[PDB]
Enzyme design. Structure first.
Site, PDB file in Angstrom:
ATOM      1  N   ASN A  70       6.855  -7.264   0.292  1.00  0.00           N
ATOM      2  CA  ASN A  70       7.846  -6.902  -0.724  1.00  0.00           C
ATOM      3  C   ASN A  70       8.468  -5.504  -0.582  1.00  0.00           C
ATOM      4  O   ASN A  70       9.399  -5.179  -1.324  1.00  0.00           O
ATOM      5  CB  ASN A  70       7.275  -7.080  -2.135  1.00  0.00           C
ATOM      6  CG  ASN A  70       6.150  -6.111  -2.431  1.00  0.00           C
ATOM      7  OD1 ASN A  70       5.209  -5.988  -1.642  1.00  0.00           O
ATOM      8  ND2 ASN A  70       6.236  -5.416  -3.554  1.00  0.00           N
ATOM      9  N   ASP A  95       9.369 -16.569   8.030  1.00  0.00           N
ATOM     10  CA  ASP A  95       8.903 -17.895   7.672  1.00  0.00           C
ATOM     11  C   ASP A  95       9.878 -18.557   6.703  1.00  0.00           C
ATOM     12  O   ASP A  95      10.469 -17.891   5.839  1.00  0.00           O
ATOM     13  CB  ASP A  95       7.521 -17.819   7.036  1.00  0.00           C
ATOM     14  CG  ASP A  95       7.465 -16.828   5.890  1.00  0.00           C
ATOM     15  OD1 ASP A  95       7.844 -15.652   6.101  1.00  0.00           O
ATOM     16  OD2 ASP A  95       7.030 -17.220   4.794  1.00  0.00           O
ATOM     17  N   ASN A 116      10.307 -12.469  -0.607  1.00  0.00           N
ATOM     18  CA  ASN A 116      10.355 -11.082  -1.075  1.00  0.00           C
ATOM     19  C   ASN A 116      10.603 -10.056   0.015  1.00  0.00           C
ATOM     20  O   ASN A 116      11.090  -8.969  -0.262  1.00  0.00           O
ATOM     21  CB  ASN A 116       9.093 -10.740  -1.869  1.00  0.00           C
ATOM     22  CG  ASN A 116       9.011 -11.499  -3.175  1.00  0.00           C
ATOM     23  OD1 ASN A 116      10.008 -12.031  -3.662  1.00  0.00           O
ATOM     24  ND2 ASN A 116       7.819 -11.565  -3.740  1.00  0.00           N
TER      25      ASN A 116
HETATM   26  N1  5AE Z   1      10.190 -19.188  -3.005  1.00  0.00           N
HETATM   27  C1  5AE Z   1       9.292 -18.293  -2.545  1.00  0.00           C
HETATM   28  N2  5AE Z   1       8.375 -17.720  -3.376  1.00  0.00           N
HETATM   29  C2  5AE Z   1       7.492 -16.836  -2.884  1.00  0.00           C
HETATM   30  N3  5AE Z   1       7.500 -16.509  -1.579  1.00  0.00           N
HETATM   31  C3  5AE Z   1       6.535 -15.529  -1.048  1.00  0.00           C
HETATM   32  O1  5AE Z   1       5.195 -15.788  -1.487  1.00  0.00           O
HETATM   33  C4  5AE Z   1       4.483 -14.563  -1.328  1.00  0.00           C
HETATM   34  C5  5AE Z   1       3.174 -14.584  -2.113  1.00  0.00           C
HETATM   35  O2  5AE Z   1       3.424 -14.775  -3.513  1.00  0.00           O
HETATM   36  C6  5AE Z   1       5.473 -13.486  -1.763  1.00  0.00           C
HETATM   37  O3  5AE Z   1       5.276 -12.265  -1.050  1.00  0.00           O
HETATM   38  C7  5AE Z   1       6.844 -14.097  -1.490  1.00  0.00           C
HETATM   39  O4  5AE Z   1       7.564 -13.364  -0.477  1.00  0.00           O
HETATM   40  C8  5AE Z   1       8.412 -17.079  -0.756  1.00  0.00           C
HETATM   41  O5  5AE Z   1       8.465 -16.794   0.453  1.00  0.00           O
HETATM   42  N4  5AE Z   1       9.305 -17.972  -1.239  1.00  0.00           N
END
Ligand code: 5AE
Length: 194
Positions: A70, A95, A116
């Protein structure tokens, strides 16, 4: 038209997150660095691991942020800002939930989709989303509630290998990507099958 000057691989740092789905981008850059004989140096000034190689008379840099996902933008902004690299010359590998393991695709711009890492980069780059993305399929667990545990989990053997395959496919179009020939990169890449 525009040569790539920076390739970013997204991931979380530390043994706990290593080999998890959310580190697919970092894995791509690790693979790329190894194939090109590039050392990734821990550099506090760029909040990550940084490598460099020459292509067609220009320095191309590799970056794996060592912030938490993040805060990846902090790293990308530091390095891009220092070397005056425009968003159009940046490729971010990450990813992608919306494609299965074994599929890689390229995309210019767009939103973050809840990722994030991508969100922080967009925000840090002065709200410019026009960098390019290498989208590495990791599959989707099947409900929003399961996403966080899923991306922070280690995939089973079968899914890991498929990711390796998509990374191999993407490395196959490195020449096009480095040149900024996204049209041709997409044609070659989007017609592969794992
Ligand atoms: N829609 C969605 N929601 C969340 N996330 C990732 O999940 C991780 C762990 O909660 C977070 O760092 C988001 O980047 C994500 O990549 N896509």
């Amino acid at each position: 038209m525009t040569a790539v000057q920076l390739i970013v691989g997204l991931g979380n740092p530390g043994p706990e997150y290593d080999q998890t789905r959310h580190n697919a981008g970092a894995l791509f850059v690790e693979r790329l660095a190894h194939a090109q004989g590039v050392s990734l140096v821990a550099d506090r000034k760029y909040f990550g691991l940084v490598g460099k190689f020459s292509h067609q008379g220009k320095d191309v840099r590799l970056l794996i942020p060592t912030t938490y996902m993040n805060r990846s933008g902090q790293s990308v902004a530091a390095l891009a800002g220092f070397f005056r690299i425009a968003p159009d010359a940046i490729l971010v590998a990450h990813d992608e939930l919306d494609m299965p393991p074994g599929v890689a695709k390229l995309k210019t711009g767009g939103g973050h989709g809840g990722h994030n890492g991508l969100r922080d980069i967009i925000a840090q780059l002065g709200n410019q989303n026009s960098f390019h993305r290498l989208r590495l399929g990791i599959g989707h667990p099947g409900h929003s509630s399961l996403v966080s545990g899923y991306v922070l989990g280690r995939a089973p053997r079968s899914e890991q290998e498929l990711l390796d395959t998509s990374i191999d496919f993407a490395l196959g179009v490195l020449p096009e990507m480095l040149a900024g020939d996204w049209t041709r990169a997409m044609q070659k890449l989007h017609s592969q099958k794992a």
